[PDB]
Design a protein around this ligand. Structure first.
Ligand SMILES: Nc1nc2c(ncn2[C@@H]2O[C@H](COP(=O)(O)OP(=O)(O)NP(=O)(O)O)[C@@H](O)[C@H]2O)c(=O)[nH]1
Ligand code: MET
Ligand SMILES: [Mg+2]
Lengths: 80, 409, 253, 22, 69
RNA sequence: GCGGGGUGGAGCAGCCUGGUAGCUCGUCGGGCUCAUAACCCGAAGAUCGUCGGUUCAAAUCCGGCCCCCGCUACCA
C-alpha cells in the first residue's frame, strides 16, 4: 500500500475555521461515503470539494483518529 | 496429477514463497504488479516430483529430477510421488484467504524466520488455526539461518522446542533451512517424505470440490471463433471428476429483482481437465486442478466464483441462508500484537464465517453455550454433516480469528 | 487533379500525399491542387510509421495559407471525424474522375490539364460533381455533356472511357449463464455475423474480440468510409436480436 | 414538524424493528 | 577458428592466437555460462530443456537462464 | 530507446503563438454590518533545476547533464 493524507484548517463560514482532508486515491476511495462518515463523527456540515473533503469547524484530531479507526495508516496521515 | 496438498503457513516476509521457490523452482509470480512491489497476494501455486536416491545416502538422496548422479551415483532415482503446495500470504490481513486455503491442505510447513522474535503475531495466528481446523501433519522450518549467529538459530530452536510442548506438537521436527541459497532443502524433502504422508481417499464417494481461483484464459484479442471456455481453479477433496461429466456450481449466481436477492445453481460440462501445465483425462484429491468449462468466461473472470464448490449435477446439497453452528472459543486473540482476552459472543453481532474455501459474513440470531444460529449474506452450500468452520471478529478494524466449531444439519 | 485555384482556401479539408519525411515535420502534396507541396509539423500529428509513410494519401485541414510566399501549412489533428468520412467518399468520386481523364486525354493524346480545364471545369457549372454529370451522361446522353459546352472532342472518348482502408469499431457487452454459454456466444456471433459480406457489401475484414470479460469489440474495416457502421451497426443489431433470440444477453456500450 | 416526527418515528421503528427481526 | 580436443583432453585451436585474448574470451564464457547471478559462486550446474538452459547454483540455489548456445 | 514534467511555502496555469508571471490554503491594512462571518479593495513573498547558446530581449526557442513520471496493460 501507500496512501498519504493531509489534514489542516481551512477557512469557512460561521464558526471559526473549516477542516480540509486531501490525499486520498479517488479511484479506490469513495469520498462521498467517507465524507458522510466523517460528518457523523464531527456532527458538522461538509462536502466533497474536488478531490478533497471540507468539514465545518476544527476537527483535525477527530478526523485523523477516525481515519486510523477505518484502517488507514497512522503514518500516512499528517495534521498541519 | 499431484497426490497431496501441503500448505506453507507463517508470518509475513519470513519467506514462505521463497522456500516454495527453492523446492519447486516456481515463483508465485508475485503479480497484479502490486504483488511485485508488495508480496504474495493470491494463493501461490506450484508442483514437483519427488524421487529418491536408493543407490546412495540420505537426506541428499532426496531428489527433485529423475537424476541421482547428483549424489553417490547414477541409478535413476525412484519416483515416490508428485506433490503440490499452496503458498498463502503472510500479511496480518490476508488472514481470510489463508483460512480459506487450509480447506484444501492435507498438511503444512510452518516457516518461522530465524532473525526475528519467534512468536510473531501471524506465526501464532496461523499455528493455532492449524491445530483448530485439523491439519495435524506439521513440519516447522527455521528459514533465514543464512543471516544469523550459530548461537542464535539454536536458541530459537529452543523457544520453538518449548512452544511445541504443551501444545499438540510433540515431535513436530524443526528443520532449519536457507531458502535463499536453497541450502538443506533435501533434509526438508526427507521430513516431508516422512511426516506428511499421502492420505487415502475413497473415490466411490460423492464428487465434491472447493474453488479458490477461476480465470478467463482468453488473451486480449482472441477471436470469437476460438474463445476458450470459462476456467475454474480449485481442489478436489472427495470423489473424482472425469472429462465430459455434467456438473454444477454452488450456491451459484444471484439474480436481481428490485432489491431482492436470490442465488441459484450453475450447470455446465467439464470441458477439460488440467494439473500444472499438463492435461489429464480425470482428476482426484490432493492438488489443485483447473476445469475447462463451457460457460461464458464473463462468469468467471477476475475470480468470481471464489468460495464456490463444484459437485455432481443432480446432487443433494443444501444452499443454506441460516445455519446451526456448534462452537468453542480461544481464551486469547493470538493474532493481535496484543493478546487481549476473547469477549463471549453477543447476539446481533457481525462475524466472518469462514466455511470451506468460501469467506462469508453473517449476523448472530442465537447465543447458547456452544450452539449459535447464524443468518448469512451469501448462501453456504453445506456438502456434508462434517463441515468444519472458522469464526472471526473485527477487533480493531482488521479481522481476527477468535474461535471455531462445526456446522450442523 | 489540376485545380482552378492557386492556394486552397484556409481551413479547408482535402486529400494530400506524404512526400518527404523530415525530422521536424514533412512535406505533403495537396492532390487536389496539382500536388501543391505544403508543410506539416508534428504539432498537428497525434505507431507513427504507417501514416507518416512514404506515400499513403492522408487527409488534412489547412491550418495556414500564406498567399504571399506561396507556401501552405496543414494539420491532421484538426480534422473532424465527421469531416473525415464525407470528404472520404468525395475521394473515391474525385478519383473515378481522375482515371477517366487520365486515360481519355492520353487516348486523345492531349493533356490532363486540358482534360481538367475542359471536361471537369465546365461540368462544374452544371451544378455537380462532374463524375455524376457523366453518370447521367453515359446512362442518358451526350447532350448532358454538350449543354454545358464541353468541347465535343472528349465527349465520346469520355463516355466510352467511362462504362484503401478505413477502420470502425464498437464496445458491446455479452453476458450469459447458459450451461454451454461460450458455445452460444460463438453461435450468436456466427449467426449475427452472417451473409454480411454481401448485405452491406464488399468491405475488407471484420473482427470480433474480448477486451473486457463482457465488454467486447467489433471491428469492420473497409474501402468506402460511409460503408462503415452501415455494416457495423447491422452486425451489432443482429447481435442483440439473435443474442436476444437465443438466450444470450447483448448490449452496446 | 410532523413530517419530521413521522419519519423519525418510522426510522426508529424500522431500525429497531430491524434489530428485533434480527 | 576451428579445433577439437586431444584424446588426452587438450584443446588444439587451428589458429595461432595470443595467450591473452584467450583468457579475455574465456572469462566472458565464465560470466555468461558458469557464474551465478544471485551470488557469483561459479559452483554451478547447467540444465537444458527444449530450448532453455539454466545455470544452477550449488550454494545459493538460484537458476540464471542462459541463451542455449 | 522513446515522451511528459521541474514556476513564491503546497498543489496547478503561463512556454509551440518570445517583451504583460495568473489561481486556490492561512497573514497584514482599509471597506461593508449594530457586530462575526461571507464579500470588496490594497499590501509580503519567485536566481522559474542547472551549466551556455541564438536574439534588442528568454519562464517562453535550440543543445548538456542532475534528480521526477509514464511506455503500447501479465500467462488453466
Ligand atoms: N537472507 C535471506 N533472505 C531471505 C531468505 N528467504 C527469503 N528471503 C528474502 O525475503 C524476502 C521475502 O520473500 P517472500 O517470499 O516474498 O516472502 P513471503 O513470506 O513469501 N511474502 P508473503 O508473506 O506475503 O508470502 C525476499 O526478498 C527474499 O529475498 C533467506 O533464507 N535468507
Ligand atoms: C494456478 S492453478 C495450479 C494448477 C493449474 N493447473 C495451473 O495452471
Ligand atoms: Mg511472496
Amino acid at each position: 500500500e501507500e496512501q498519504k493524507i493531509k489534514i489542516y484548517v481551512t477557512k469557512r463560514r460561521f464558526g471559526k475555521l473549516m477542516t480540509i482532508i486531501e490525499g486520498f486515491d479517488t479511484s479506490v476511495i469513495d469520498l462521498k461515503e467517507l465524507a458522510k462518515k466523517l460528518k457523523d463523527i464531527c456532527a458538522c456540515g461538509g462536502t466533497v470539494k474536488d478531490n478533497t473533503i471540507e468539514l465545518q469547524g476544527d476537527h483535525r484530531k477527530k478526523v485523523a483518529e477516525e481515519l486510523v479507526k477505518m484502517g488507514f495508516s497512522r503514518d500516512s496521515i499528517e495534521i498541519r | 496429477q499431484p497426490e497431496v496438498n501441503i500448505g506453507v503457513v507463517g508470518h509475513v516476509d519470513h519467506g514462505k514463497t521463497t522456500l516454495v521457490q527453492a523446492i519447486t523452482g516456481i515463483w508465485t509470480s508475485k503479480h497484479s504488479e502490486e504483488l511485485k512491489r508488495g508480496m504474495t497476494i493470491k494463493l501461490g501455486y506450484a508442483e514437483t516430483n519427488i524421487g529418491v536416491c536408493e543407490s546412495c545416502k540420505k537426506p541428499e538422496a532426496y531428489v527433485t529430477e529423475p537424476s541421482c548422479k547428483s549424489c553417490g551415483s547414477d541409478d535413476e532415482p525412484k519416483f515416490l510421488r508428485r506433490i503440490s503446495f499452496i503458498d498463502a500470504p503472510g500479511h496480518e490481513v490476508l488472514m481470510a484467504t489463508m483460512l480459506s486455503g487450509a480447506a484444501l491442505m492435507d498438511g503444512a510447513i510452518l516457516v518461522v524466520a530465524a532473525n526475528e522474535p519467534f512468536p510473531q503475531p501471524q506465526t501464532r495466528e496461523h499455528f493455532v488455526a492449524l491445530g483448530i481446523i485439523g491439519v495435524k501433519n506439521l513440519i516447522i522450518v527455521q528459514n533465514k539461518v543464512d543471516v544469523v549467529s550459530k548461537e542464535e538459530a539454536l536458541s530459537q530452536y529452543r523457544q520453538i522446542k518449548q512452544f511445541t510442548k504443551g501444545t499438540w506438537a510433540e515431535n513436530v521436527p524443526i528443520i532449519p533451512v536457507s531458502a535463499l541459497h536453497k541450502i538443506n532443502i533435501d533434509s526438508l524433502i526427507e521430513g516431508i517424505e516422512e511426516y506428511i504422508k499421502t492420505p487415502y481417499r475413497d473415490l466411490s464417494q460423492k464428487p465434491v470440490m472447493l474453488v479458490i481461483r477461476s480465470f478467463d484464459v482468453n488473451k486480449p484479442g482472441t477471436q470469437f471463433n476460438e474463445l476458450k471456455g470459462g476456467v475454474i481453479g480449485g481442489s478436489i477433496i472427495q470423489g473424482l471428476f472425469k472429462v465430459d461429466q455434467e456438473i454444477k456450481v454452488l450456491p451459484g449466481l444471484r439474480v436481481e429483482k428490485q432489491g431482492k436477492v436470490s442465488y441459484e445453481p450453475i450447470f455446465t460440462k467439464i470441458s477439460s481437465i488440467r494439473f500444472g501445465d499438463e492435461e489429464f483425462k480425470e482428476a482426484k484429491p490432493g492438488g489443485l486442478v483447473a476445469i475447462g468449462t463451457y460457460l461464458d468466461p464473463s462468469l468467471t473472470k477476475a475470480d468470481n466464483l471464489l468460495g464456490s464448490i463444484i459437485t455432481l449435477a443432480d446432487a443433494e446439497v443444501p444452499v443454506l441462508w441460516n445455519i446451526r453452528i456448534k462452537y468453542n472459543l480461544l481464551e486469547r486473540v493470538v493474532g493481535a500484537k496484543e493478546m487481549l482476552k476473547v469477549d463471549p459472543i453477543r447476539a446481533k453481532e457481525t462475524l466472518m464465517l469462514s466455511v470451506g474455501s468460501s469467506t462469508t459474513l453473517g449476523i448472530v440470531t442465537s447465543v447458547k453455550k456452544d450452539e449459535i444460529e447464524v443468518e448469512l449474506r451469501r448462501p453456504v452450500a453445506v456438502w456434508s454433516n462434517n463441515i468444519r468452520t472458522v469464526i472471526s471478529r473485527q477487533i480493531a478494524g482488521r479481522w481476527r480469528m477468535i474461535g471455531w466449531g462445526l456446522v450442523e444439519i | 487533379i489540376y485545380s482552378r485555384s492557386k492556394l486552397p482556401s484556409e481551413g479547408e479539408i482535402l486529400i494530400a500525399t506524404v512526400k518527404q519525411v523530415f525530422d521536424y515535420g514533412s512535406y505533403v502534396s495537396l492532390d487536389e491542387y496539382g500536388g501543391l507541396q505544403a508543410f506539416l509539423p508534428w504539432s498537428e500529428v497525434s505507431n507513427i510509421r504507417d501514416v507518416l509513410k512514404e506515400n499513403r494519401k492522408v487527409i488534412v485541414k489547412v491550418i495556414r495559407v500564406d498567399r504571399r510566399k506561396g507556401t501552405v501549412d496543414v494539420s491532421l489533428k484538426k480534422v473532424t471525424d465527421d469531416e473525415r468520412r464525407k470528404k472520404n467518399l468525395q475521394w473515391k468520386k474525385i478519383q473515378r474522375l481522375d482515371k477517366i481523364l487520365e486515360l481519355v486525354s492520353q487516348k486523345l493524346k492531349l493533356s490532363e490539364k486540358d482534360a481538367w480545364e475542359q471536361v471537369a471545369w465546365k461540368l462544374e457549372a452544371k451544378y455537380g460533381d462532374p463524375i455524376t454529370a457523366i453518370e447521367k451522361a453515359v446512362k442518358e446522353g451526350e447532350k448532358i455533356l454538350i449543354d454545358a459546352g464541353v468541347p465535343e472532342i472528349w465527349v465520346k472518348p469520355l463516355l466510352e472511357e467511362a462504362s484503401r482502408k478505413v477502420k470502425m469499431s464498437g464496445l458491446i457487452t455479452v453476458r450469459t449463464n447458459e450451461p454451454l454459454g461460450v458455445e452460444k456466444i460463438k453461435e450468436v456471433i456466427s449467426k449475427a455475423l452472417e451473409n454480411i459480406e454481401q448485405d452491406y457489401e464488399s468491405l475488407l475484414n471484420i473482427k470480433i474480440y474480448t477486451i473486457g470479460a463482457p465488454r467486447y469489440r467489433v471491428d469492420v474495416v473497409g474501402t468506402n468510409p460511409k460503408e462503415a457502421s452501415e455494416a457495423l451497426n447491422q452486425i451489432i443489431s443482429n447481435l442483440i436480436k439473435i443474442g436476444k433470440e437465443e438466450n444470450v444477453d447483448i448490449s452496446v456500450v | 414538524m410532523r413530517w419530521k416526527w413521522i419519519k423519525k418515528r418510522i426510522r426508529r421503528l424500522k431500525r429497531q424493528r430491524k434489530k428485533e427481526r434480527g | 577458428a576451428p579445433g577439437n580436443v586431444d584424446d588426452k583432453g587438450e584443446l588444439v585451436i587451428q589458429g595461432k592466437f595470443s595467450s591473452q585474448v584467450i583468457n579475455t574470451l574465456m572469462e566472458r564464457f565464465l560470466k555468461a555460462y558458469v557464474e551465478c547471478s544471485t551470488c557469483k559462486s561459479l559452483d554451478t550446474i547447467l540444465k537444458k530443456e527444449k530450448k532453455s538452459w539454466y545455470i544452477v547454483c550449488l550454494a545459493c540455489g538460484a537458476q540464471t537462464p542462459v541463451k542455449p548456445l
